[PDB]
Amino acid sequence: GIALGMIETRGLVPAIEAADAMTKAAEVRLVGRQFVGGGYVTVLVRGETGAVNAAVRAGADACERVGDGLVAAHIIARVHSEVENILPKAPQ
Amino acid sequence: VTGIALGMIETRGLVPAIEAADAMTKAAEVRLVGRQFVGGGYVTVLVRGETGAVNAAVRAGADACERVGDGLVAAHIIARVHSEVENILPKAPQ
Amino acid sequence: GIALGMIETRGLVPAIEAADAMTKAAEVRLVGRQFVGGGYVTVLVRGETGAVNAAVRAGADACERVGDGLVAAHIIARVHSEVENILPKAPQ
Amino acid sequence: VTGIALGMIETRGLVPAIEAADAMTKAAEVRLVGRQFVGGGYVTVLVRGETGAVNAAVRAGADACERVGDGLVAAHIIARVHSEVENILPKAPQ
Amino acid sequence: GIALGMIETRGLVPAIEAADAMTKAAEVRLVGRQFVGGGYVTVLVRGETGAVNAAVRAGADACERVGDGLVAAHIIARVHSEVENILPKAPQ
Amino acid sequence: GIALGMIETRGLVPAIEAADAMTKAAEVRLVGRQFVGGGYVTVLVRGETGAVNAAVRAGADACERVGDGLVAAHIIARVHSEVENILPKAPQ
Amino acid sequence: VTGIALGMIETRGLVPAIEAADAMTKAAEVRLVGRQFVGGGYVTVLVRGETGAVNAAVRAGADACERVGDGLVAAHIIARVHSEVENILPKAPQ
Amino acid sequence: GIALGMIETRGLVPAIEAADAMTKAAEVRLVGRQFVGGGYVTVLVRGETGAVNAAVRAGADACERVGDGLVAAHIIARVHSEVENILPKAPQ
Amino acid sequence: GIALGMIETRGLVPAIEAADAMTKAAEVRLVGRQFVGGGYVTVLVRGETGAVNAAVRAGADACERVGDGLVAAHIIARVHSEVENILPKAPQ
Amino acid sequence: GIALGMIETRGLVPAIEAADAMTKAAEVRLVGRQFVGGGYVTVLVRGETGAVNAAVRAGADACERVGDGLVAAHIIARVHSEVENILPKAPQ
Amino acid sequence: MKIMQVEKTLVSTNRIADMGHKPLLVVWEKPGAPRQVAVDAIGCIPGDWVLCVGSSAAREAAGSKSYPSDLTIIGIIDQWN
Amino acid sequence: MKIMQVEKTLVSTNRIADMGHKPLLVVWEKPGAPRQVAVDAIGCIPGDWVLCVGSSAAREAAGSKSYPSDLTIIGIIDQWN
Amino acid sequence: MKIMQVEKTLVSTNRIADMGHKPLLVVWEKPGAPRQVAVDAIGCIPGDWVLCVGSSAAREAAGSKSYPSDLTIIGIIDQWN
């Protein structure tokens, strides 16, 4: 699957909780955790479209009430090839 | 993809920036040349191309990312970039 | 133990106090202190589920009234294998 | 200077932190072991020493820096530091 | 001289203006410019006590109205030897 | 597909109508019909995530107005291996 | 998975019970040992494990199933089960 | 002992808690757990009269606030020989 | 994929915009553009269920404000074999 | 220890009570009793910082309600070498 | 608080009514040590290692400020030998 | 009050909710002496020599007049052997 | 109450703020006996024979109904050996 799931949170604890929720909810691969700056943290998953939809829904629900909460939850079904250059491949 | 025009979109957070980059690259024939973490939550994505393509791409990206996450901060186009500014413009996204 | 506990604070002093309280409360290992950005600091511990529960509760209680205070206190009893790639293994 | 107690002061900005460090080191027999830029403007200074010395130093530093610049955020003392926390405590200021 | 002058500003432009003002006002050495984080910038000078007093006064006056303005202006006549380890020696 | 769809109804007629609706709406396998007790009846389907989503939506819409109506409609994208032991494999 | 603690969740209907079982098994290292049709619509799911794991699992399961279908009835934990009660506790889900 | 104690609850969780509390409270033998129907569950113990009295009191106290609660808690010190034909001898 | 996506618009410009939006949003095949009569225009896509869901959502959002706007947006997860005879195979 | 504690009172009776309380409270050495003039009397102790802190607190508490009462109770943990020239070394 | 092992149950039929319905357990620090009786506020089996509190805290731990108890079990130790 | 040395931590997951979030430590007067459990109101490491108070004072020292404790650590001794 | 001899002073810098300013003394029934720590409400020197009260009376003897003490010195014995 090549769909992209994205959850942004205020702080790292809601981000980790969201990542755990998505990876438990569906068969998606956690490909990155980014410290954006100013407290924003983003977690990204890849997988089939339906799996990513389920994972993002579960992650948003799980992290909405943890810590300072959730900022954004977005799904891109098909990513343009140019955008692949700014997406991490592995969660270093 | 040729052209030396520059299109920039600034957002609050990474998710709207990624949505804007996807929208720009889908809307027009532009190259994504960089994503920059400015600090304090600002994220900027930059594209290059012909003037008309960059104009269309920036319009589409602003429209797409204005409602995602914490939203959109800036959307700007420069038709011709001075050679001095090319030293501070990234060449590849990485 | 493979359970995970984390505490997020505003500033470094409450984070240090929270980490000290957790490690004194139970048999848990401090695996990371992350400067999230914008003032957020997160400390993470690993151990058996009951030990982590006790440690996180004690740490939240201890750091609640220190400095700018506590942001989040969370326990994940069973961590998905994907999240281990973004969890640190030792502090720096 | 011996002792394993820890004293910490958190301020908004570097000037109050430097004033607090000077006040602590002048007030008591403590070692300045670190100044950390937390992010978002927070700065933390850490001292080590005996429990009474660290107590006096932290009191003096908080009093001195509370009125400098953007002020004081936190002032805390830990008499005995768990060995796990020593891994995240700096050993030399640098 | 071993006195210490310190000016903290919101942003880099007032900090540079303050540094120029102090170094023009008195015979002081600019020993550091620190990006504190969150927008704070600090500039430090060393010199004789009276020179540092004059320099800090001039720098505060010059930078108080530039950009987002001045945060703090402080003088320490005699610095404890322990504090020297956290002060830069040269403005890298 | 290993996603799980579930519809619970008050009575057997809405349950049968829901099962017919899901199996017609998407390519899902009807794996069980359970008489819970007290009038509750549950019908379970398995399949790909998107197929199960469509099937459950259609079944809920079809059975919501039949007889005593619908009690619950739920989708689990990825079922934990332990839960498989309480799910029927074939609709006996 | 070892441990002799017992965690039980009672719901109205089978769908919330299945959701609770999934949530428990995903949340903690527990074994699902039974699903029982009590009568009158009550359904009970039982897990075994260590005390902390069972505590976490029961909390997660109650939170997950409280809003599904006709809802949640009971959520309880017994750290140590008397040997007499093991005769009425199921050993395998089946 | 030939005394009989029984506790009736709404649901199985309070019944299990009541049986556990009784057997922990006194030296009594759990001889049955009956699904009465309509949600009623009854647990029965046998033993010496004082032991059964203590066990039933403790079990009622423990199960009063669990789930849908307690229905009945009764002690029969001397059971007529006819009732033994409807009393179970061992649980299933 | 054999799911069917359908968008109906008032006029041809919103229909073309919707077709572009769906084909960019997901991996779907544009199989027909029909001039219904009276100004109605319908565009049809085929693909996997999740891809078609994403494509139809994107197309409806894109064409809702163009020209005289959107009339209908519908998804059929599994098409009955009889209905295949009235659906175009290629966009002539 | 080289820390310094001092208590100032109005009159000699509260000063004697304060000195007695300090020396009984901790391991400190009474190094001076000074008749300041105008009724002021000051007693000074030396020792380790914690011992001096405890002694001064106890002495202030003890002498607060004796005679004309307490004027000052102060602790100097680190005494500058210059002040040692005005500090007495032994009482008279 | 003391760490003690539960030995067996104890029944006193004619105990004062202030004791309510709470059960009683025989506890000791180790087999062969002097025996004590505690109010079981948790629910424990023989052989369990438990935490017991005395003094006035046992009264509130057993249910009320006026409960007649000077030893109450307040928890089961997760791992002990 | 008694002078005791902290040995190790203690965890009771199913302890009564009245215990709050406070941690528990195993203490003894010396290695090999009978073990006791205290509420840690200070934050102590193993090997620390601590001051422990019992009776009704331990309840208030642990946080409230109704806290279920009969032994609370109230300080770390600066120098002891 | 118990008759005890004062041995030495005790300092705990990080003790809880509820302890106020009161000093602490190490006491024992005789040299070599187990050591205890008492709040000095009188002011005593090493070697003094003192009267020590425990339980809840020590709290009020130390200054207030909520003072954290279970052993307080309340007097010096005029003549004792």
- What CA–CA distance (Å, rounded) separates D66 from D62? 6
Does residue A46 contact residue A31 with C-beta atoms inside 8 Å?
Answer: yes
Instruction: Note whether L22 contacts C: Cβ–Cβ < 8 A.
Output: yes
J73 CB near a chain M CB, below 8 Å?
no
Question: Do G54 and G77 meet the contact criterion of CB atoms below 8 Å apart?
Answer: yes
- Cα–Cα dist C4/C89, whole Å: 12
Report yes or no: M13 at the D interface, CB cutoff 8 Å: yes
CB within 8 Å: L78 and D80: no
Chain C nearest-CA distance from A46, in A, is 12
Method: cryo-EM
Q: In 3-state terms, what secondary structure has residue I30?
A: strand
- Nearest CA among J20, J23, D1, G18 for reference residue F88: G18
How many angstroms separate the CA atoms of B62 and B75, rounded?
Answer: 6
Q: Which of residues 7-66 of M touch L (CB under 8 A)?
A: 10-16, 18-19, 24, 26, 34-38, 54-56, 58-59, 66
Cβ distance G29 to C75 less than 8 Å, yes or no, reads: no
What is the rounded CA–CA span in Å between residue K80 and residue G58? Answer: 24
Residues A12, M12: Cα–Cα separation, whole Å: 38
Q: In what order do the strands lie in the sheet with I40-47?
A: I29-37, I40-47, I3-10, I70-76
Whether H and I touch, i.e. at least 3 CB pairs below 8 A, reads as no
Chain E neighbors (3+ CB pairs < 8 Å): D
Q: How many helices (H) and strands (E) does chain M have?
A: 1, 5
- Which of L13, L21, L23 faces C24 most closely, judged by CB atoms? L23
Q: Under a CB-based contact definition with an 8 Å cutoff, are residues C41 and D38 in contact?
A: yes
Q: Does L13 touch chain G (CB under 8 A)?
A: yes
Q: Say how many Å lie between the first and final Cα of chain E, rounded.
A: 21
Angle at B27 between CA B26 and CA B31, to 5 degrees: 65
The phi, psi pair for J36, rounded to 5°, reads -70, -40
The subunits that touch chain D, with at least 3 C-beta pairs less than 8 Å apart, are C, E, J, L, M
Tokens representing residue G48 in the block: 């075994």
Q: Do L43 and C27 touch (CB under 8 A)?
A: no
Q: Which of F36, F39, F76 sits opposite G43 (nearest CB)?
A: F36
| Collapsed DSSP state (helix, strand, coil) of residue J54 | helix
| C-alpha count within 13 angstroms, C-beta hemisphere, residue M12 | 30
Chain F residues bordering chain I (beta-carbon distance below 8 Å): 24-27, 48-51, 53-55
Task: Enumerate the residues of chain J whose CB falls inside 8 A of the CB of residue D55.
Answer: 49-50, 53
Q: How far is M1 from chain J (nearest CA, A)?
A: 22
DSSP 8-state symbol, E55: H
Contacts of A27 in chain F (CB under 8 A): 78
Give DSSP secondary structure letters for F17-36. HHHHHHHHHSS-EEEEEEEE
Cβ M61 vs Cβ M53: under 8 Å: yes
Could you tell me if G68 and F72 are in contact, meaning their C-beta atoms sit under 8 angstroms apart?
Answer: yes
K20 to chain H, any CB pair closer than 8 A? The answer is yes
Q: Enter the tokens of residue K54.
A: 């005395």
Q: Is K11 in a helix, a strand, or coil? A: coil
Answer positive or negative: Cα dihedral of E75, E79, E82, E84: positive
DSSP L59: H
d(CA B50, CA B59): 14
I31/I6 Cα distance (integer angstroms): 10
Task: Please answer yes or no on whether A20 and C83 come within 8 Å at the CB atom.
Answer: yes
Could you give the C-alpha distances from H69 to G41, G61, H8, H12, J16, in angstroms and in order?
Answer: 16, 20, 9, 10, 70
Residues 6+ apart with CB under 8 A from F62: F17, F18, F20, F21
Contact indicator for A86, B35 with CB cutoff of 8 Å: yes
For I71, half-sphere exposure in the C-beta direction (CA atoms, 13 angstrom radius) is 17
- CA dist E45 and L30 (Å) reads 56
Minimal CA separation from D53 to chain J, in Å: 6
| Mutation to test the G interface, candidates H8, H9, H16, most G Cβ within 10 Å | H16
Distance from CA of L20 to the nearest CA of M (A): 19
Look up residue B13 and give its DSSP letter: S
What is the helix (H) or strand (E) element at residue E63, kind and residue range? helix E49-63
Subunits in contact with chain J (3 or more CB pairs closer than 8 Å)? D, M
Nearest alpha carbon to residue F49 among F41, F61, F38, F57: F57
Residues of G in contact with L13 (CB under 8 A): 51-52, 55, 79
Strands (E), chain K: 2-10, 24-28, 36-40, 49-54, 71-76
Q: What are E16's two structure tokens?
A: 């540079």
Under an 8 A CB cutoff, do K23 and H60 touch? no
Pairwise CB contact (< 8 Å): D10 & C67: yes
Tokens in use for I65?
Answer: 């404000």
Residue of A nearest to C87 (CA): A16
Q: Which residue has the tokens 């759990």?
A: H30
- For residue I26, the chain A residue with the least C-alpha distance is A78
Nearest chain G Cα distance for residue K45, angstroms? 6
Residue of D nearest to E80 (CA): D22
Q: Which residue's entry shows tokens 């033994």?
A: H84
For D87, counting Cβ atoms within 10 Å of its Cβ (0-12 exposed, 13-18 middle, 19+ buried), the class is middle
Q: CB–CB of K48 and G52 under 8 A?
A: no
Residue H80, number of CB atoms within 10 A of its CB: 7
- Chain C residue with the nearest C-alpha to that of D7: C13
- By residue count, chain B amounts to 94
Q: Which residue of F has its CA nearest to I53?
A: F50
State how far the Cα of D21 lies from the Cα of D44, in Å rounded to an integer: 10
Domain ranges in chain K are 1-81
Closest CA in chain D for residue E76: D19
The DSSP result for C9-72, as a single string, is: EESHHHHHHHHHHHHHHSS-EEEEEEEEETTEEEEEEEE-HHHHHHHHHHHHHHHTTSTT-EEE
**Other residues' Cβ atoms within 10 Å of the Cβ of residue D92:** 9
CB contact under 8 A, M68 and L77: no
**D18/E83 CB distance under 8 A:** yes
**Residue pair E18/E59 in contact by the 8 Å Cβ criterion:** yes
Pairing mode, if any, of strands K71-76 and K36-40? parallel
- Cα separation, A2 vs A77, in Å, equals 7
Q: How far is CA M72 from the centre of its chain?
A: 4
The four Cα atoms L7, L11, L16, L18 give a dihedral, to 10 degrees, of 60
Chain B residue closest to A72 (CA)? B69
CA distance G62 to D50: 49
Q: Which residues of G touch K78 (CB under 8 A)?
A: 50-52
Cβ atoms within 10 Å, residue L63:
17
CB-defined contacts C:D, below 8 A: 76
Q: Look at D18 and E87 and tell me if their CB atoms are within 8 Å.
A: yes
Q: Hey, are the CB atoms on D83 and L45 less than 8 Å from each other?
A: yes
Sign of CA dihedral K65, K67, K68, K74: negative
* Domains assigned to chain B: 1-87 (3.30.70.1710)
The full DSSP string for A1-65 is --EEEEEEEESHHHHHHHHHHHHHHSS-EEEEEEEEETTEEEEEEEE-HHHHHHHHHHHHHHHTT
Closest residue in C to D36 (Cα) is C12
CB K23 within 8 A of CB K45: no
Cross-strand bridge partners of residue K2: K52
Q: Please, which residues have CB within 8 angstroms of residue C27's CB and are 6 or more apart in sequence?
A: C47, C48, C51, L9, L11
- Separation between Cα atoms, residue H44 and residue H48, nearest integer Å: 14
Can you tell me whether residue L51 is helix, strand or coil? Answer: strand
Cα D88 to its chain centre, rounded Å, is: 15
Burial H23-57 (b: 16+ CB within 10 A, else e): bbbbbbbbbbbbbeeebbbbbbbbbbbbbbbbbbb
- What DSSP character marks residue I1? -
CA dist list (Å): D55 to G93, H42, L74: 60, 63, 17
CB proximity list for I25: less than 8 A, separation 6 or greater:
A77, A78, I54, I55, I57, I58, I59
Instruction: Give CA J78 to chain center in angstroms.
Output: 15
Q: In 3D, which of J51, C46, L39, C24 has the Cα closest to residue D80?
A: C24
Candidate from C20, C24, C60 with C-beta closest to L21: C60
Task: Compare CB distances from F37 to G18, G40, G70 and report the shortest one's residue.
Answer: G40
Which chains have at least 3 CB atom pairs separated by less than 8 Å from chain B?
Answer: A
Alpha-helix residue ranges (DSSP H) falling in chain K: 57-61
Q: Is L56 on the interface with C (CB under 8 A)?
A: no
Q: K74 and L10 in contact by Cβ < 8 A?
A: no
Say how many residues make up chain M: 81
Record the tokens describing residue M77, joined without a space.
């014995």
